[PDB]
Symmetry: D2
Subunit: 461 residues, 4 copies
Amino acid sequence: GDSDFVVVANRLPIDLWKRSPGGLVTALEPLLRRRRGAWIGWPGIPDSDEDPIVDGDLVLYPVRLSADDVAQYYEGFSNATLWPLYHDVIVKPIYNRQWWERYVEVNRRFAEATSRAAARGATVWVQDYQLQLVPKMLRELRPDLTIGFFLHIPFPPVELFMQLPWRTEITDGLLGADLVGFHLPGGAQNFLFLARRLVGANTSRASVGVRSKFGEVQIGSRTVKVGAFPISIDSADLDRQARQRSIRQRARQIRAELGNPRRILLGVDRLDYTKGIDVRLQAFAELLAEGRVNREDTVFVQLATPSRERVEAYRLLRDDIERQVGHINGEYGEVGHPVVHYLHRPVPREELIAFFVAADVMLVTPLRDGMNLVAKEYVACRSDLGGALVLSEFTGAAAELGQAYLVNPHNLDHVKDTMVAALNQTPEEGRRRMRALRRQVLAHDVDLWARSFLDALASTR
Amino acid sequence: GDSDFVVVANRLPIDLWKRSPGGLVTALEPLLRRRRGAWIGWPGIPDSDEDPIVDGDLVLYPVRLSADDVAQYYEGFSNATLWPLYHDVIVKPIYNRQWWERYVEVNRRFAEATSRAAARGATVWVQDYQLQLVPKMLRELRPDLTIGFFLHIPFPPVELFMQLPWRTEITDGLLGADLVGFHLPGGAQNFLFLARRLVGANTSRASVGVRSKFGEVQIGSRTVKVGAFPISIDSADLDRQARQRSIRQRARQIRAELGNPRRILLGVDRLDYTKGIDVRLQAFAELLAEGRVNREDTVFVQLATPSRERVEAYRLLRDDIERQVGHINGEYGEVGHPVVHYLHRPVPREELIAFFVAADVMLVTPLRDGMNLVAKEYVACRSDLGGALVLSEFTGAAAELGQAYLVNPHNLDHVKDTMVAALNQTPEEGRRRMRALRRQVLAHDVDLWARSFLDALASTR
Amino acid sequence: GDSDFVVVANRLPIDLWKRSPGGLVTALEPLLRRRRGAWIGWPGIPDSDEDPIVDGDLVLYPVRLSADDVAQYYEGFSNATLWPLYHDVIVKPIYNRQWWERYVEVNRRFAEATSRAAARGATVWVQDYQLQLVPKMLRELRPDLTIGFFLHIPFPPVELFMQLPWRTEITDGLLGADLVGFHLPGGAQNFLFLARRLVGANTSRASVGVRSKFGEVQIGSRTVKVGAFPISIDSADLDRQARQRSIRQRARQIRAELGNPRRILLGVDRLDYTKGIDVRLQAFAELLAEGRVNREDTVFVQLATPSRERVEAYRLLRDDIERQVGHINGEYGEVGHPVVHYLHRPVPREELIAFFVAADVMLVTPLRDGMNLVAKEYVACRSDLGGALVLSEFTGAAAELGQAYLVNPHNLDHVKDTMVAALNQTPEEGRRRMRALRRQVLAHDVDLWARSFLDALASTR
Amino acid sequence: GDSDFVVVANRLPIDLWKRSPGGLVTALEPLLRRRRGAWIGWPGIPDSDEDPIVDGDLVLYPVRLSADDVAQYYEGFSNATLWPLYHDVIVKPIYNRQWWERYVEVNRRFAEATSRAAARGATVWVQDYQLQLVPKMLRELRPDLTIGFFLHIPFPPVELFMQLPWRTEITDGLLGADLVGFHLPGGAQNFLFLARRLVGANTSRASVGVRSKFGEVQIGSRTVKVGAFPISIDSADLDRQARQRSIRQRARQIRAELGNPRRILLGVDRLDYTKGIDVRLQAFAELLAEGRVNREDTVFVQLATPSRERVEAYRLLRDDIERQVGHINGEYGEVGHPVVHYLHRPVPREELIAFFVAADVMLVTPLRDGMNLVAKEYVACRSDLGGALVLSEFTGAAAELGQAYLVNPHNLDHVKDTMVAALNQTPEEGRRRMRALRRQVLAHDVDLWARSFLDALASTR
Ligand SMILES: OC[C@H]1O[C@H](O[C@H]2O[C@H](CO)[C@@H](O)[C@H](O)[C@H]2O)[C@H](O)[C@@H](O)[C@@H]1O
Ligand SMILES: OC[C@H]1O[C@H](O[C@H]2O[C@H](CO)[C@@H](O)[C@H](O)[C@H]2O)[C@H](O)[C@@H](O)[C@@H]1O
Ligand SMILES: OC[C@H]1O[C@H](O[C@H]2O[C@H](CO)[C@@H](O)[C@H](O)[C@H]2O)[C@H](O)[C@@H](O)[C@@H]1O
Ligand SMILES: OC[C@H]1O[C@H](O[C@H]2O[C@H](CO)[C@@H](O)[C@H](O)[C@H]2O)[C@H](O)[C@@H](O)[C@@H]1O
């Protein structure tokens, strides 16, 4: 093809069609302004054409997937095998050979579409866990390409990874890249150890740095670079948006509609068993039972975005969370005044920002999360320096946001102590923490992340 | 003893101590004003004395029960064997011989306490399913006594009753009475058939009337009278109470606190699997899904009084209902505005009356209920002629309250159609129904009921 | 059509094709020898033709049903609504309007096929719970016909029947017959009461006799006869078959293959929650635990024929029973010697007869069963007068087989006592019981049953 | 005290009393023959004395534990927190603060008993996961002691270990030792990484060898040695025992009692969710379904020893396995001939050896296991060179027994392929493998293991 920079991701960067706002596709804009750029992905509709679509800024290459393809490659292998395994088997992975076979077939199709788009010697950046076979497949089709891969979810310890019957194929798949990146040094180090243990490759032994001190894996005549690049957001843009009059007005209206509580706790997540929503609710219930939170002036809002309804584990999770909600309100609410407000629906971005602005305590308590950008978004929104972030240690974000109230979500006693502390912090202490968190997040944005990864990738040439 | 009229019931008519208001004990007041009256029952505290307590109006005879006695006789045999069996095995009865043995032992203890209190030739009125052995035991101890028994819960069909391993002992127990009463002719007729089938007694074959046309069972030289006496409330007293300024003010405040909805649906029940609370919630959810109820101006309040927490079936039921609540609000509510308000706690009587006055639609949808006085209380409160009663056919109340919106709770399509009809009735049609229901309930009160039963019992002399 | 006697049943009397042996179709042979006979039913294959098939003896009229028809009318309405409801709601019936609508549509199709076959003034005999609408539909199409209906499963008490949202339609459906028959007087009496309560018809009030003393329901100008006709088997034929050399040789071989136990208990059932298989296993386990049965010389064989695998309740039941089997053997067996042998597969008739001949104790312990012919078959096979029948009271068979060891399956203590008694009976006492049971079963066979029903039906002319 | 060599373990090496045979206590005999030896442990009876008991060979120091102590420290913290966590969270660990507090209290009690027994400068060897706090506690009480600790179960990856709310306390506890040993280099390397990540200690970075190339952790002025020492059995003694006439006679009798099958598969385990018993049964069922194993001449014997009945996860596991057993026999067995024989009971050692000798295929398929000595015992018993070992990769044993048929138990397709391969191996290939496995196991016995650990520990002086 005629593109010298190519992104490969499970989905095209569109909404159903118009270009989706923000995200990676926006972070890359000033590179696409000087490159012949392409994006390979599934357009989100079954059995579409694979005819290229010019976006002026980008050229989009659609990948044809049937509904059955999506069921077995995506909702099957990706979300019911890889997702739970990589997130510390919070639920039991399902090992299914037909899912594997479709995952291979679909990965090859992405590889073919990439080659079609990629000019000679082009730079290719493959995204995330659905496409781990693509780098090797692409190198075999197109040895002229420079190939980067970034994993957005955690890379699990070897003891868990080894469960995968296709462990070697996945590892070889990733080793097809010139650069393999993870959010955290821990993931990079697991990958190095896996390369030694499973594949028998020679690797570097030193600790892996942050955006520096890269590891290496020797594969025959070529070297694979391994690095840690923690993703972030467009901090400045969110900071700006959150100051808008209409957002501030909505935040005040939210508090009014909640009956003007003294304190609002907020959870914002896709409904996933990795997110520790159940832990927040358990902690809140026990605090109310113990009289350590005031049921008359404190309210918890949980906004759950529907996710993966076709996967049974998610339906069961929804059932447990919805039981907790009903239970806590039945026990501690009053007619016309719940202590927990729970919504299971998509939420417009501007409404979410208004909730960040209204919330006195942000509860981000995943059991395991690659990064978690909701924590960083809350921080970027609080230019008033109000609020408080309660953050699980088991997120990538916890490595950068040390000034937050950090918790081990498995330590329920300390989660409860911490929620009380966040709710009752002095104004000055709250400001001190938020000021420090904002300094970090404003300085370490998605632009820094993307430039760091691409600089590392370019250096493999 | 020195009492010529004696009531026998599982509990003494007290709150923990002071005399409990209303109820049977108040209905009997003008008889106790001309009788030497006694009440036999458990005082609600473990291992108490059995020393008589003069209430001036009554003499109370406490029955000593240990916590283990209560666990096996009451929460065991009474509530986990008899209760589910008599209510059409909505949950599976547990047949446990140790529970049976304690039930016999405790029933004998009540019989002994009764004899202690009862003067020669005294009239005795035994209450309800916990004490079905007492009449026979008492007749053996005291053949001089006139003995009535009234069952407050349904009497099941023979096909289900026969499951009970101690079916014959229970039947003989009831046949010790001079008069056996039920709310409905159906129960009386089941009892007659059971007497023929199981005990081989000669009985009458005709239909049993309401407070008339009594059946009979011949037991050797004596005859057992069998009748239907549908219980009611002190209709006039509730009518009066509901007109009080403070009640009306509270009802307005309730509507204000709910955000001034156009329509309020109300459920008021002890949390029991017989009450069909799950059906109301399912119907409401599907109506919202179908857009047939307006989620912006219609709200459902369910007040569940905690019941029998030590019984596993009740804990599981609570879990399912609380899930439904959380689910429906997550799907159709807004932050600061649920469509379902659910409270799991005891509610003061005056607060309940205020809710009756506020509610546009009363949802009384049991799967099976002896009478259900909540339906009649709602009617007695609506002297403004507003409101609407949606009532399950499977209640004793449905035989008298035919002007209500009657439903088969198993027919979910018709339950949904009926809720829409009740919510959207014309003012005139609503008034027509409520006027007719009030005529019935005001005329057929607890006084009429108690006099009818005691007249029938006296006639056995 | 040209048939003056017509049977209507869910399935044609064939195996897939050849005529199925025994059963109703064989009982009717000497009537078909003097009649122009027809049989209407589904041939058991989806979307077949409805072209008549001459069997010389009979003419078969196939009813076309699609796989979807079978799923909603048969496995849906018939087996997941009616079956559990009529058997005392051992599992919760599912009320589904789409199932109902298909049940109506399919019943009409059977009615149309019947009319096609039936000559003018012909006699029609409709079979069982799948076809309860056919009599009314047929009378409307063909008022010239004489119509009988026999229900092979129990008819439930009114309190349970009334749950059915289409209760009135089913009742009207049955009332289309000139004769409605049940195995037992109890079913007939429930039907009479239902006719009065639900339909408001005038009925007889007397007890219903066995093959006599019929009840009646007045429907406008015509009368519906109601009777009890307990089904049986071809007793003489089974008695004869069980004496065959090869059967006796197989029975000895069975005992040899079980390691020559002193005592064999046997269960033979379709795998259904009505059959009380779980109760047998629980009783056997507790007897072994208590050392009241000798684990070294006593063995229990349970032969479960697979049934209704597409219905979830049956899959769950299979799971529980299979757990019990594994558990009991793990606890009381030895390697090479289980105490329970369990087979989940169809069993050839001649193999079943050999098991009847080998078994010292026959365990027939349904929670609820219309008749249960397995009990009568065991009796007919034991012309050696050996063996012992343990029989649930909750079967139609218990009304005729009073000399068996009768048990209330809910009374587990007595089930256990009874199994010990049967296992250890003296030879003389065993013979006394078996001799008496055989006198009853040899005299009251399927021929007597069929003649009695047809005589009653003919008398409605 | 007066002992210069002291073993510390959860239980005293006795049966209830007499000295228990074999095991660690026998491996140490020639050291105790030249040492003043002591053993500290719970005698297995509640609230005993702590008076020392001379065994001539050893002095036993009993630790007093109440039944409540055992419930919270052992069945609670040890078996419901640590056990599932360290075995890759196959079931969800329970984090309970009261269990933790009792675990600390009990560990201190063991430490106090050790100090009481230990002479000045004595060598102390603490055993296993129940006693991980003891080394630090002991060093604080008795800085004069040389302290070794060996973990017999796996040491989990840091991502899982970090869940533990008392992660730091456990790690500090282990760091109190002069030598920390694990079966495998992987465990040692996890420990080193944990020491760096959690405790911030300086450690060695190199790979850890087998009984060599030790790691180190610097703790202030002292160094902690870290090593891998894979445990084994008394190979020669078992080899000798398995040749006994009575054992060989019993093995032949076992095959006779199974109906002389051509092939016997054997599983021998404590009933634990770590052991992968469910996987064996699933594989066997699918092979039978596929006709790849002959149901007429192949039989699977599973001997499950009862374990931890007071822990709910184990009761649920028992239920699932027992269901599988019942199911497979119901589907593929014949009356008098199951395809699966399952026993849930303790088995005498001599009976187990006879089963090893009889078994054609040994199925050792844990999901995760520290070592698994059953695999090595089978090998030591087969001096006839018959048999075949199917072994999970996820055992310590798989690192030494590479000549076995190794399987990933999560790869069910390959487990099935492998069982077929083992069942149908040529005699020569079977012998080749068994000969090689025996060379390893005969050379690497419990004596080599114990000497290696004690040499390493002595070198810390
Ligand atoms: O499953 C697709 C998900 O991808 C994103 O989340 C992952 O990537 C983020 C950015 O690197 C991380 O913050 C996060 O921890 C990862 O799980 C996306 O944000 C999610 O909405 C998607 O569900
Ligand atoms: O279990 C005790 C219950 O007794 C009452 O309810 C029964 O008696 C009422 C009056 O006859 C009926 O209306 C009702 O249908 C019966 O269940 C009491 O009202 C309940 O609160 C108690 O739970
Ligand atoms: O569901 C069809 C079943 O019909 C028969 O069983 C019923 O009819 C028998 C004869 O009247 C009774 O003995 C029995 O109690 C009824 O359930 C048939 O025998 C069964 O195999 C069928 O499952
Ligand atoms: O829970 C106590 C268990 O300890 C032993 O098992 C562990 O130690 C063995 C020897 O090091 C290993 O083979 C094994 O993998 C470990 O789990 C003992 O053998 C078990 O019976 C005990 O359950």
